[PDB]
Tab-separated table of C-alpha atoms and ligand atoms in Angstrom:
chain	number	residue	atom	x	y	z
A	27	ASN	CA	104.448	-7.941	151.555
A	28	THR	CA	107.125	-7.973	154.385
A	29	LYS	CA	105.236	-4.763	155.422
A	30	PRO	CA	104.289	-3.167	152.055
A	31	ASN	CA	104.404	0.609	151.546
A	32	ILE	CA	100.945	2.215	151.193
A	33	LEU	CA	100.072	5.457	149.394
A	34	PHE	CA	96.477	6.700	149.617
A	35	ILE	CA	95.861	9.505	147.089
A	36	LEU	CA	92.515	10.930	148.323
A	37	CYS	CA	91.363	13.913	146.210
A	38	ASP	CA	88.639	16.423	147.078
A	39	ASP	CA	85.078	16.623	145.564
A	40	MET	CA	85.701	14.343	142.513
A	41	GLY	CA	82.558	12.474	141.348
A	42	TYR	CA	82.184	8.829	140.342
A	43	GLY	CA	81.875	9.923	136.664
A	44	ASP	CA	84.719	12.533	136.612
A	45	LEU	CA	87.543	10.072	135.474
A	46	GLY	CA	87.977	8.722	131.887
A	47	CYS	CA	88.021	5.091	133.137
A	48	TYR	CA	84.582	5.708	134.885
A	49	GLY	CA	83.132	7.129	131.606
A	50	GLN	CA	83.984	10.875	131.747
A	51	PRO	CA	83.904	12.061	128.112
A	52	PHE	CA	85.458	15.552	128.280
A	53	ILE	CA	88.506	15.266	130.589
A	54	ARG	CA	91.796	13.442	129.861
A	55	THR	CA	92.885	11.245	132.813
A	56	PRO	CA	95.539	9.053	131.098
A	57	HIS	CA	97.643	8.242	134.222
A	58	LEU	CA	94.669	7.163	136.392
A	59	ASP	CA	93.195	5.280	133.370
A	60	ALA	CA	96.559	3.444	132.978
A	61	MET	CA	96.638	2.824	136.780
A	62	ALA	CA	93.190	1.179	136.427
A	63	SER	CA	94.427	-0.861	133.385
A	64	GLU	CA	97.240	-2.240	135.661
A	65	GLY	CA	95.021	-2.559	138.728
A	66	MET	CA	91.539	-2.935	140.144
A	67	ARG	CA	88.705	-0.417	139.541
A	68	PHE	CA	85.992	-0.554	142.279
A	69	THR	CA	82.414	0.083	141.052
A	70	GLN	CA	80.509	0.163	144.432
A	71	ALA	CA	83.003	1.888	146.765
A	72	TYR	CA	81.706	4.678	149.002
A	73	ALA	CA	82.950	7.760	150.858
A	74	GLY	CA	82.478	7.918	154.658
A	75	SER	CA	80.061	10.842	154.069
A	76	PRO	CA	78.671	13.079	151.300
A	77	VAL	CA	80.962	15.924	152.610
A	78	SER	CA	84.714	16.337	153.277
A	79	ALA	CA	85.418	16.414	157.066
A	80	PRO	CA	83.288	13.370	158.107
A	81	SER	CA	84.292	11.350	154.987
A	82	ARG	CA	87.988	11.853	155.928
A	83	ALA	CA	87.138	11.235	159.635
A	84	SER	CA	85.462	7.916	158.670
A	85	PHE	CA	88.622	6.875	156.741
A	86	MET	CA	90.904	7.899	159.694
A	87	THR	CA	88.757	6.294	162.506
A	88	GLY	CA	87.295	3.160	160.833
A	89	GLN	CA	83.821	4.414	161.994
A	90	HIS	CA	80.615	5.207	160.074
A	91	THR	CA	78.933	8.616	160.677
A	92	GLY	CA	76.335	7.046	163.031
A	93	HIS	CA	79.273	6.680	165.507
A	94	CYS	CA	82.069	9.084	164.423
A	95	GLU	CA	82.928	12.204	166.520
A	96	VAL	CA	83.017	14.151	163.178
A	97	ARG	CA	79.747	13.894	161.154
A	98	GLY	CA	79.820	17.310	159.422
A	99	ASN	CA	81.855	20.416	158.610
A	100	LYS	CA	82.237	22.450	161.862
A	101	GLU	CA	84.365	25.642	161.788
A	102	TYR	CA	86.592	26.825	164.689
A	103	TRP	CA	88.015	29.916	162.860
A	104	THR	CA	84.726	32.021	162.692
A	105	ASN	CA	85.572	34.078	165.851
A	106	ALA	CA	89.411	33.682	165.720
A	107	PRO	CA	91.552	36.815	166.132
A	108	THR	CA	93.012	38.414	162.959
A	109	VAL	CA	96.741	38.453	162.000
A	110	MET	CA	97.997	40.584	159.048
A	111	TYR	CA	99.957	39.082	156.108
A	112	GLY	CA	101.018	42.270	154.291
A	113	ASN	CA	97.700	44.157	153.768
A	114	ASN	CA	95.693	40.848	154.058
A	115	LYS	CA	93.582	40.151	157.190
A	116	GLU	CA	93.821	36.418	158.039
A	117	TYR	CA	92.516	34.114	160.816
A	118	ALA	CA	95.082	33.497	163.607
A	119	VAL	CA	93.572	29.987	164.253
A	120	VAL	CA	92.173	27.828	161.386
A	121	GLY	CA	90.429	24.481	161.032
A	122	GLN	CA	87.600	22.112	161.840
A	123	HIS	CA	86.224	19.948	164.708
A	124	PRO	CA	88.945	17.678	166.173
A	125	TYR	CA	89.005	13.869	165.952
A	126	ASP	CA	88.240	12.240	169.337
A	127	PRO	CA	91.680	12.055	171.078
A	128	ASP	CA	90.581	8.758	172.795
A	129	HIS	CA	89.855	6.843	169.508
A	130	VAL	CA	92.769	5.503	167.379
A	131	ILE	CA	93.321	6.775	163.810
A	132	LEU	CA	94.959	4.867	160.937
A	133	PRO	CA	98.372	6.705	161.007
A	134	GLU	CA	98.802	5.743	164.725
A	135	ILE	CA	98.293	2.046	163.829
A	136	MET	CA	100.917	2.397	161.016
A	137	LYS	CA	103.324	4.094	163.532
A	138	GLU	CA	102.823	1.142	165.976
A	139	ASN	CA	103.709	-1.226	163.015
A	140	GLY	CA	107.105	0.558	162.469
A	141	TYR	CA	105.936	2.686	159.453
A	142	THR	CA	107.082	6.233	158.787
A	143	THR	CA	104.005	8.395	158.026
A	144	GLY	CA	103.534	11.287	155.566
A	145	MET	CA	100.479	13.422	154.797
A	146	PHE	CA	100.467	16.105	152.068
A	147	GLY	CA	97.388	18.263	151.559
A	148	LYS	CA	94.177	18.889	153.499
A	149	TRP	CA	94.033	17.772	157.180
A	150	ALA	CA	90.439	18.843	158.099
A	151	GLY	CA	90.679	16.760	161.356
A	152	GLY	CA	91.201	19.494	163.959
A	153	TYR	CA	92.082	23.183	164.219
A	154	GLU	CA	95.588	24.564	164.982
A	155	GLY	CA	96.400	23.940	168.705
A	156	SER	CA	93.559	21.349	169.059
A	157	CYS	CA	94.036	17.781	170.449
A	158	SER	CA	93.932	16.427	166.825
A	159	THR	CA	96.620	17.955	164.564
A	160	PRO	CA	98.883	15.704	162.430
A	161	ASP	CA	101.856	16.006	164.862
A	162	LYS	CA	99.664	14.698	167.761
A	163	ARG	CA	97.972	11.920	165.689
A	164	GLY	CA	100.771	9.801	164.181
A	165	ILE	CA	102.023	11.876	161.173
A	166	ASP	CA	105.856	12.269	160.991
A	167	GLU	CA	105.826	14.627	157.919
A	168	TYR	CA	102.843	16.913	157.239
A	169	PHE	CA	102.554	19.756	154.692
A	170	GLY	CA	99.362	21.413	153.409
A	171	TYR	CA	96.141	23.002	154.694
A	172	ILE	CA	95.106	22.294	158.315
A	173	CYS	CA	91.813	24.056	157.420
A	174	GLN	CA	89.252	23.099	154.702
A	175	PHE	CA	88.147	26.780	154.446
A	176	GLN	CA	91.762	27.993	153.921
A	177	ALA	CA	92.035	25.348	151.114
A	178	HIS	CA	89.421	27.356	149.069
A	179	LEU	CA	92.313	29.605	147.918
A	180	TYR	CA	94.844	27.826	145.670
A	181	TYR	CA	97.077	30.937	146.251
A	182	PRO	CA	96.797	31.280	150.035
A	183	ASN	CA	98.593	33.555	152.553
A	184	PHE	CA	100.231	30.510	154.278
A	185	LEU	CA	100.409	26.734	154.359
A	186	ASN	CA	100.912	24.492	157.417
A	187	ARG	CA	103.849	22.175	158.133
A	188	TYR	CA	104.875	19.649	160.751
A	189	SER	CA	108.259	18.127	159.823
A	190	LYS	CA	110.042	15.751	162.208
A	191	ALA	CA	113.022	16.101	159.805
A	192	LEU	CA	113.176	19.935	160.354
A	193	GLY	CA	112.658	19.533	164.183
A	194	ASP	CA	109.295	21.366	164.252
A	195	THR	CA	107.862	21.197	167.850
A	196	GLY	CA	104.297	21.226	166.414
A	197	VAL	CA	102.357	22.513	163.390
A	198	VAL	CA	103.756	25.830	162.108
A	199	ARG	CA	102.720	28.256	159.358
A	200	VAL	CA	104.838	28.650	156.197
A	201	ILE	CA	104.050	32.129	154.805
A	202	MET	CA	103.594	32.354	151.007
A	203	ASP	CA	105.998	35.353	150.927
A	204	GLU	CA	105.115	36.316	147.285
A	205	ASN	CA	101.310	35.651	147.568
A	206	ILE	CA	100.833	38.017	150.601
A	207	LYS	CA	102.047	40.988	148.433
A	208	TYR	CA	98.653	40.812	146.620
A	209	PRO	CA	94.970	40.757	147.649
A	210	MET	CA	92.989	37.545	148.415
A	211	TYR	CA	90.159	38.531	146.012
A	212	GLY	CA	89.592	40.593	142.814
A	213	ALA	CA	91.623	41.523	139.682
A	214	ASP	CA	95.083	41.295	141.406
A	215	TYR	CA	94.513	37.855	143.039
A	216	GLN	CA	95.976	36.079	139.974
A	217	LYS	CA	99.243	38.070	140.456
A	218	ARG	CA	99.837	35.586	143.351
A	219	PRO	CA	102.472	33.143	141.958
A	220	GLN	CA	102.683	30.447	144.746
A	221	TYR	CA	100.179	27.746	143.632
A	222	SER	CA	99.394	25.379	146.578
A	223	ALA	CA	98.603	22.189	144.559
A	224	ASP	CA	102.086	22.308	142.897
A	225	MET	CA	103.850	23.194	146.188
A	226	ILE	CA	102.058	20.433	148.182
A	227	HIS	CA	102.770	17.805	145.451
A	228	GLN	CA	106.443	18.977	145.342
A	229	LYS	CA	106.682	18.437	149.168
A	230	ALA	CA	105.021	14.977	148.844
A	231	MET	CA	107.541	14.043	146.059
A	232	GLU	CA	110.499	15.320	148.156
A	233	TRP	CA	109.225	13.041	151.025
A	234	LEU	CA	108.766	10.028	148.666
A	235	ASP	CA	112.369	10.728	147.357
A	236	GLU	CA	113.717	10.211	150.951
A	237	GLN	CA	112.144	6.689	151.229
A	238	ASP	CA	114.034	3.410	150.544
A	239	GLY	CA	113.412	-0.382	150.774
A	240	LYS	CA	114.304	-0.417	154.521
A	241	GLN	CA	111.535	1.266	156.560
A	242	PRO	CA	107.948	0.879	155.321
A	243	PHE	CA	106.133	4.184	154.492
A	244	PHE	CA	102.451	5.169	154.767
A	245	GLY	CA	101.583	8.301	152.739
A	246	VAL	CA	98.224	10.092	152.633
A	247	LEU	CA	98.167	12.496	149.642
A	248	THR	CA	95.008	14.582	150.369
A	249	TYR	CA	95.445	16.876	147.338
A	250	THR	CA	92.702	19.548	147.260
A	251	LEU	CA	92.036	19.207	143.464
A	252	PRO	CA	89.372	19.497	142.030
A	253	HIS	CA	87.737	21.362	144.975
A	254	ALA	CA	86.855	25.023	144.320
A	255	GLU	CA	88.026	27.706	143.801
A	256	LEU	CA	88.487	27.046	140.029
A	257	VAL	CA	91.825	28.927	139.775
A	258	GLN	CA	95.136	27.420	138.664
A	259	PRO	CA	98.267	28.247	136.638
A	260	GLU	CA	97.417	29.678	133.157
A	261	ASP	CA	99.551	27.007	131.443
A	262	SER	CA	99.392	24.409	128.632
A	263	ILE	CA	96.937	22.192	130.639
A	264	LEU	CA	94.446	25.046	131.088
A	265	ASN	CA	94.930	26.324	127.486
A	266	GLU	CA	94.291	22.813	126.036
A	267	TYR	CA	90.771	22.992	127.562
A	268	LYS	CA	90.165	26.700	126.766
A	269	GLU	CA	90.752	25.677	123.093
A	270	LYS	CA	88.523	22.501	123.391
A	271	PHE	CA	85.513	23.987	125.251
A	272	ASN	CA	83.636	26.653	123.179
A	273	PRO	CA	81.486	28.375	124.211
A	274	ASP	CA	82.242	28.219	127.984
A	275	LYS	CA	80.789	29.883	131.116
A	276	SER	CA	82.259	32.024	133.917
A	277	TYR	CA	81.966	32.479	137.696
A	278	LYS	CA	81.308	35.875	139.263
A	279	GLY	CA	83.168	35.129	142.561
A	280	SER	CA	82.197	34.695	146.250
A	281	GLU	CA	84.644	36.634	148.483
A	282	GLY	CA	82.850	35.265	151.622
A	283	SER	CA	83.553	31.718	150.312
A	284	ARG	CA	87.170	32.529	149.283
A	285	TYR	CA	86.214	31.495	145.705
A	286	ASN	CA	87.782	33.938	143.256
A	287	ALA	CA	85.935	35.024	140.098
A	288	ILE	CA	87.202	33.172	137.016
A	289	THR	CA	86.386	32.702	133.356
A	290	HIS	CA	86.113	29.505	131.159
A	291	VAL	CA	84.846	27.323	134.119
A	292	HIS	CA	84.558	24.104	131.971
A	293	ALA	CA	88.244	24.602	131.008
A	294	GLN	CA	89.234	25.348	134.668
A	295	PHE	CA	87.563	22.194	136.059
A	296	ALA	CA	88.901	19.885	133.288
A	297	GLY	CA	92.341	21.420	133.800
A	298	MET	CA	92.227	20.767	137.580
A	299	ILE	CA	91.434	17.047	137.060
A	300	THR	CA	94.066	16.593	134.251
A	301	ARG	CA	96.576	18.401	136.544
A	302	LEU	CA	95.758	15.981	139.416
A	303	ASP	CA	96.033	13.029	136.964
A	304	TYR	CA	99.551	14.311	135.973
A	305	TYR	CA	100.486	14.401	139.712
A	306	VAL	CA	99.379	10.769	140.054
A	307	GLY	CA	101.548	9.856	137.004
A	308	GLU	CA	104.549	11.549	138.721
A	309	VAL	CA	103.948	9.514	141.977
A	310	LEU	CA	103.782	6.210	140.041
A	311	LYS	CA	106.881	7.144	137.939
A	312	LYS	CA	108.846	7.929	141.159
A	313	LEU	CA	107.967	4.508	142.748
A	314	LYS	CA	109.295	2.789	139.564
A	315	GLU	CA	112.448	4.966	139.482
A	316	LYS	CA	113.209	4.019	143.165
A	317	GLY	CA	112.539	0.240	142.681
A	318	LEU	CA	109.542	0.505	145.131
A	319	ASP	CA	106.692	-0.379	142.660
A	320	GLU	CA	106.414	-4.133	143.525
A	321	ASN	CA	106.288	-3.432	147.329
A	322	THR	CA	103.865	-0.415	147.236
A	323	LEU	CA	100.079	-0.486	147.237
A	324	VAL	CA	98.674	2.740	145.668
A	325	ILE	CA	94.987	3.632	146.005
A	326	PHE	CA	93.356	6.633	144.336
A	327	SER	CA	89.966	7.854	145.572
A	328	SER	CA	87.819	10.946	146.244
A	329	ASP	CA	86.356	12.039	149.631
A	330	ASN	CA	82.775	12.649	148.289
A	331	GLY	CA	80.660	13.201	145.145
A	332	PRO	CA	80.957	15.963	142.543
A	333	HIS	CA	80.498	19.638	143.427
A	334	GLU	CA	78.824	22.768	141.988
A	335	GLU	CA	81.029	25.399	143.716
A	336	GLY	CA	83.290	28.134	142.310
A	337	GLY	CA	81.910	27.661	138.745
A	338	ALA	CA	81.862	23.825	138.697
A	339	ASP	CA	79.194	22.580	136.227
A	340	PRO	CA	78.435	18.929	137.167
A	341	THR	CA	75.400	18.964	134.825
A	342	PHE	CA	77.815	19.599	131.873
A	343	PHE	CA	80.440	17.050	133.035
A	344	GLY	CA	77.692	14.563	134.075
A	345	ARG	CA	76.233	14.133	130.522
A	346	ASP	CA	77.031	10.357	130.395
A	347	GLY	CA	76.824	9.714	134.179
A	348	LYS	CA	74.481	7.149	135.786
A	349	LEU	CA	74.174	8.372	139.425
A	350	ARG	CA	71.860	10.979	140.887
A	351	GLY	CA	73.038	13.825	143.083
A	352	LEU	CA	75.992	15.862	144.230
A	353	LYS	CA	78.169	16.384	147.260
A	354	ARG	CA	75.912	16.828	150.425
A	355	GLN	CA	73.335	14.222	149.185
A	356	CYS	CA	73.030	10.576	150.411
A	357	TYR	CA	71.827	9.763	146.846
A	358	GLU	CA	74.453	7.566	145.098
A	359	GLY	CA	76.102	10.544	143.374
A	360	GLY	CA	76.975	12.191	146.756
A	361	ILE	CA	78.591	9.079	148.307
A	362	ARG	CA	79.760	6.633	145.560
A	363	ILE	CA	83.337	7.549	144.523
A	364	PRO	CA	86.148	6.473	142.176
A	365	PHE	CA	88.410	3.964	143.904
A	366	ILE	CA	91.387	2.471	142.011
A	367	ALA	CA	94.010	0.137	143.533
A	368	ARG	CA	97.331	-0.893	141.963
A	369	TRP	CA	99.986	-3.171	143.480
A	370	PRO	CA	101.873	-5.033	140.736
A	371	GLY	CA	101.893	-8.810	141.345
A	372	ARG	CA	99.416	-8.637	144.288
A	373	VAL	CA	96.305	-6.788	143.031
A	374	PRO	CA	95.078	-8.460	139.827
A	375	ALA	CA	95.586	-6.153	136.814
A	376	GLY	CA	92.749	-4.899	134.570
A	377	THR	CA	89.963	-5.959	136.951
A	378	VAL	CA	86.674	-4.438	138.087
A	379	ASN	CA	85.537	-5.158	141.663
A	380	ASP	CA	81.861	-4.742	142.643
A	381	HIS	CA	82.480	-5.360	146.406
A	382	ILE	CA	80.192	-3.021	148.411
A	383	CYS	CA	82.564	-1.127	150.782
A	384	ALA	CA	83.096	2.302	152.373
A	385	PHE	CA	86.003	4.373	153.721
A	386	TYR	CA	85.470	3.016	157.304
A	387	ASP	CA	86.595	-0.404	155.841
A	388	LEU	CA	90.090	1.001	155.024
A	389	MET	CA	91.311	0.679	158.670
A	390	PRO	CA	90.692	-3.145	158.922
A	391	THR	CA	91.777	-3.556	155.217
A	392	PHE	CA	95.177	-1.927	155.907
A	393	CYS	CA	95.514	-3.798	159.226
A	394	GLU	CA	95.008	-7.098	157.352
A	395	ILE	CA	97.555	-6.103	154.621
A	396	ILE	CA	100.269	-5.170	157.200
A	397	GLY	CA	99.612	-8.399	159.203
A	398	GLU	CA	98.220	-6.504	162.220
A	399	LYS	CA	95.900	-9.201	163.652
A	400	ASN	CA	93.018	-8.523	166.113
A	401	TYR	CA	93.358	-4.739	165.589
A	402	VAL	CA	90.088	-4.022	167.549
A	403	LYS	CA	91.328	-5.854	170.729
A	404	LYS	CA	94.719	-4.063	170.351
A	405	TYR	CA	93.537	-0.472	169.636
A	406	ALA	CA	90.036	-0.258	171.255
A	407	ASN	CA	89.939	2.219	174.181
A	408	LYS	CA	89.145	0.165	177.354
A	409	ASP	CA	88.155	3.441	179.204
A	410	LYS	CA	85.122	4.005	176.857
A	411	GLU	CA	81.636	2.517	177.554
A	412	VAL	CA	81.947	1.277	173.903
A	413	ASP	CA	84.609	2.063	171.240
A	414	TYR	CA	82.977	1.630	167.799
A	415	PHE	CA	84.789	-0.007	164.839
A	416	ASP	CA	82.418	-0.366	161.833
A	417	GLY	CA	84.682	-1.649	159.020
A	418	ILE	CA	85.104	-5.016	157.261
A	419	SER	CA	88.515	-5.732	155.640
A	420	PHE	CA	88.313	-6.051	151.824
A	421	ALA	CA	91.978	-7.170	151.627
A	422	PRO	CA	90.779	-10.608	150.304
A	423	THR	CA	88.859	-9.226	147.243
A	424	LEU	CA	91.625	-6.588	146.719
A	425	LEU	CA	94.119	-9.487	146.380
A	426	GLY	CA	91.596	-11.441	144.166
A	427	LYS	CA	91.184	-14.197	146.788
A	428	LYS	CA	88.763	-16.066	149.113
A	429	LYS	CA	86.882	-15.458	152.433
A	430	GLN	CA	85.630	-11.955	151.391
A	431	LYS	CA	83.076	-11.011	154.126
A	432	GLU	CA	80.072	-8.816	153.158
A	433	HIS	CA	78.404	-5.907	154.956
A	434	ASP	CA	74.778	-6.445	156.017
A	435	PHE	CA	74.524	-2.657	155.398
A	436	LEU	CA	76.420	0.543	154.698
A	437	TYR	CA	75.348	3.650	156.697
A	438	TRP	CA	75.638	7.467	156.263
A	439	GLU	CA	74.019	10.447	158.023
A	440	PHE	CA	74.470	14.141	157.235
A	441	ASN	CA	73.147	17.201	159.072
A	442	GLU	CA	73.096	19.959	156.377
A	443	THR	CA	70.568	18.171	154.041
A	444	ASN	CA	69.113	16.249	157.074
A	445	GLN	CA	69.613	12.870	155.347
A	446	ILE	CA	70.302	9.275	156.360
A	447	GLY	CA	71.465	6.700	153.778
A	448	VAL	CA	71.398	2.899	154.097
A	449	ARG	CA	72.489	0.415	151.441
A	450	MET	CA	71.465	-3.275	151.898
A	451	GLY	CA	72.475	-5.109	148.706
A	452	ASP	CA	70.244	-3.925	145.823
A	453	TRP	CA	68.126	-1.836	148.300
A	454	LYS	CA	68.968	1.845	148.967
A	455	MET	CA	67.176	4.054	151.537
A	456	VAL	CA	67.475	7.858	151.557
A	457	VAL	CA	65.745	9.383	154.610
A	458	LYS	CA	65.002	13.098	153.949
A	459	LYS	CA	63.841	15.159	156.981
A	460	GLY	CA	62.847	11.870	158.739
A	461	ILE	CA	60.856	10.552	155.694
A	462	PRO	CA	62.117	7.301	154.074
A	463	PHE	CA	62.504	7.022	150.275
A	464	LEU	CA	63.378	3.563	148.915
A	465	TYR	CA	65.156	2.677	145.637
A	466	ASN	CA	66.286	-0.523	143.931
A	467	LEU	CA	69.753	0.139	142.488
A	468	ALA	CA	69.471	-2.886	140.098
A	469	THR	CA	66.273	-1.599	138.385
A	470	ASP	CA	66.769	2.130	139.212
A	471	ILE	CA	70.505	3.081	139.477
A	472	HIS	CA	69.544	6.816	139.134
A	473	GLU	CA	67.165	6.622	142.212
A	474	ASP	CA	64.229	8.044	140.118
A	475	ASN	CA	61.441	5.719	141.433
A	476	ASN	CA	60.612	5.840	145.176
A	477	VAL	CA	59.110	2.372	145.917
A	478	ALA	CA	58.845	2.659	149.772
A	479	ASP	CA	55.036	2.178	149.445
A	480	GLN	CA	55.517	-1.198	147.604
A	481	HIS	CA	58.027	-2.582	150.215
A	482	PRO	CA	56.929	-1.675	153.796
A	483	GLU	CA	58.842	-4.719	155.283
A	484	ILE	CA	62.106	-3.604	153.530
A	485	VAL	CA	61.523	-0.026	154.825
A	486	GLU	CA	61.123	-1.362	158.439
A	487	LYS	CA	64.247	-3.638	158.116
A	488	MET	CA	66.360	-0.670	156.887
A	489	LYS	CA	64.926	1.688	159.595
A	490	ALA	CA	65.870	-1.035	162.177
A	491	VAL	CA	69.481	-0.573	160.925
A	492	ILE	CA	69.230	3.244	161.425
A	493	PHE	CA	67.874	2.810	165.009
A	494	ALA	CA	70.703	0.315	165.827
A	495	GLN	CA	73.588	2.280	164.132
A	496	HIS	CA	72.784	5.935	165.006
A	497	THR	CA	74.190	7.167	168.366
A	498	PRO	CA	73.670	10.777	169.560
A	499	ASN	CA	76.317	13.407	168.771
A	500	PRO	CA	75.699	16.879	170.273
A	501	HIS	CA	77.531	18.712	167.386
A	502	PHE	CA	75.763	17.099	164.341
A	503	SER	CA	71.974	16.458	164.312
A	504	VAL	CA	69.762	14.459	161.894
A	505	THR	CA	66.034	13.650	162.090
A	506	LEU	CA	65.469	9.901	162.598
A	507	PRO	CA	62.428	8.321	160.910
A	508	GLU	CA	59.366	7.599	163.142
A	509	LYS	CA	59.675	4.249	165.063
B	601	LIG	C1	81.378	30.916	156.805
B	601	LIG	C2	81.245	29.675	155.959
B	601	LIG	O1	81.149	28.546	156.469
B	601	LIG	N1	81.353	29.874	154.627
B	601	LIG	C3	80.803	29.001	153.602
B	601	LIG	C4	81.868	28.121	152.960
B	601	LIG	O2	82.667	27.506	153.964
B	601	LIG	C5	81.153	27.077	152.106
B	601	LIG	O3	82.112	26.198	151.489
B	601	LIG	C6	82.388	24.997	152.181
B	601	LIG	O4	83.427	25.239	153.135
B	601	LIG	C7	83.654	24.111	153.988
B	601	LIG	C8	84.599	24.557	155.075
B	601	LIG	O5	84.777	23.536	156.057
B	601	LIG	C9	84.212	22.990	153.121
B	601	LIG	O6	85.429	23.417	152.531
B	601	LIG	C10	83.240	22.619	152.002
B	601	LIG	O7	83.861	21.644	151.134
B	601	LIG	C11	82.789	23.882	151.222
B	601	LIG	O8	81.705	23.590	150.354
B	601	LIG	C12	80.271	27.731	151.036
B	601	LIG	C13	79.334	26.735	150.370
B	601	LIG	O9	79.477	26.701	148.947
B	601	LIG	O10	79.418	28.742	151.628
B	601	LIG	C14	80.062	29.703	152.460
B	601	LIG	O11	79.129	30.606	152.971
B	602	LIG	CA1	85.442	16.964	149.533
C-alpha cells in the first residue's frame, strides 16, 4: 500500500463475452487472459450506463444515472463553427455535456491525496472550453480525444493534449500533420498514416516511463478500441484474422457517423480487440520493468456492452454468450462488462468474484484503497441541497477479505431506448417506455421470460427503488412507471 499506484484501463464498447477469459471463442486475448490468471475476474460487475458518456460520468462522479449530471450522449459540436485542416472541414469546438463543476470527480480526490494523474484516450466529460475539461478537473497529463464523435475516426485531423510537463495553459489541439493531407472519408482515407490508438498508447507509455517509486500515480487509460470505426493498421494482427475468418462481411460506410467503409469486418473487430490486448501486455510489462508491479493495482474494464456499429457483428462474436442485448439496452448485455483486477500479493490470484457492483462504486473503492477515510464528509459540496454519492466500496472483496457490504439495488436509466434497469439480487427489472418487465437472473440469465405478472410485490418493491433513486434532469428524460 503506502499509497499504491492505480491504473484503470477502461476500453470502449467491449461486451462481457468479447474476451477469451469470459468465453470468447474467436479472438485471442492472451495478455488479459494471463492478467485474469494472476488476478480476480468479476462476473457481476456493471457499467454506469449502457452508453459511453454517462457510464464514464458514473465512474468519475461516484453517482448512478438517477442522480448524475450526465445520463446520455449530448453533443455540443453540432452548430460549432468550421476550421479547415488542409481541404478537410472540421468542428472548431468538439465534445459532450460537461460534468457538474460543483461535484467532485475521482482524479480530484487522487490529486488531494498527493497523486500525479494521467489520462490517455477519450475524455467525453465536457467540450473544449467548458467547465469540465481534464486540465480543470484534476488531470496533470492528458492526451487523446476530448470528443466521443471525433473518436469515430482512428485517423483523425487532430488529437487533444493538456500536459503540465509541456506548460500547456489548457487543452490544445495537436494536428495530425500527415492525416490532414487526405480526406476524412472514401478510397483515400486509408492513406492517412497517423493511427490514434497507437499514438495514444505511445503517449500513455511515455507518461508511465516518467513514473518512479516516489510519487504515487493514478492513470486512466480510456483507449477507444474496439469502438467503431472498424479501421486500423493493415498489419500482422489484422492479417492473422483475415486468414482465419472466411468468408467475412463488409461495411458500406456512414460519412455522417465518421465510420469509414471497410472490408473483412470480423477480421477488423477481432484485430481491434487483439491489438488492445497487446497494449495491455505492454502496460503490464512496463510496470515489471520499472519495479512497480507489487505497488500497482491494474483494473481492465469496458464502459458498456457490445456494439453493432461500423460493421461490428455481435451476433457472430456472441455465439457462445449468455447475456441478452447490446449497448443502449438495460438488458444484462448492455450493462454487464468485463472487469479484471490484478495487484500481485494483494488481490488473490486466479479468482472469480461474483460481488454485484457498478462503476459508481469505484470512487469509494479507490478512496478505501488509498486510506482516504470519510470521503463523503470531505468531498461533498455543502452549498448543494443534496450532493449524491451512490457507491459502496468493494475494496474488501477485491483484497479477498471481510466486511464486504452489499447493495440493496443497482440502478440505471437511459433516454435513447427510454429504459430503467434495477437489479436486486437474483431479480432484474427492465422498464421499457414506462412498462416494467421482470426477470430472474438465476433461472433466466438471458432475460427471455418476463415474469412481472407472477411477482406483483417484487415489481412494486423495485418500482419503489426507481421512485426513490430517480431525480429530474432537464437534459436527459426517461418515462417512469405508473405509481
Ligand atoms: C449527429 C450524430 O449524433 N451522429 C450520430 C453518431 O454520433 C452516432 O454514433 C454515436 O456517437 C456518439 C457521440 O457522442 C457516441 O460516440 C456513441 O458511442 C456512438 O454510437 C451514430 C449511431 O450509430 O449515428 C449518427 O447519426
Ligand atoms: Ca462505449
